[PDB]
Amino acid sequence: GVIIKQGCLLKQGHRRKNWKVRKFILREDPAYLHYYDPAGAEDPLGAIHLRGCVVTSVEEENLFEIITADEVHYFLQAATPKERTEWIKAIQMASR
Template structure:
């Protein structure tokens, strides 16, 4: 698999049926997802502000949460605020 060591801005869309998280490149004009994954069997949790994964470069300012897929792929996502991070986690957890 591919390991990304830098941060990319992405727009996320959460779908409930089937439980799926799509992500889009906000700089692109067309409206097709650049990726996504099923939320079934995933684990989601908040990370402490010092919980940035080793080797990750870029401007990381906290409000992080992590999603681990059933295939053991780790996604680190940075919300714009602590409140938004809580909202994302609370929305995702029932779908896992």
């Protein structure tokens, strides 16, 4: 799978609804969005199978959400609206 996009974002705790910085790597052959420790561990902390996902902005600034085909929800926060828009479209093209 080839790398499409790469960057850090704030991801909301599924858990206690907290927010944490993670490094995200979007790939396209296999449609996947992996997240790691904000550091340099390339062994992922989780994976998001993107095939058939739904990704939309959420009206905390620059929020957007990912809904997997089986309805697991991911809440992310970009640093700027331009970044958010870029991630959303990238994720959309990847799960083609």
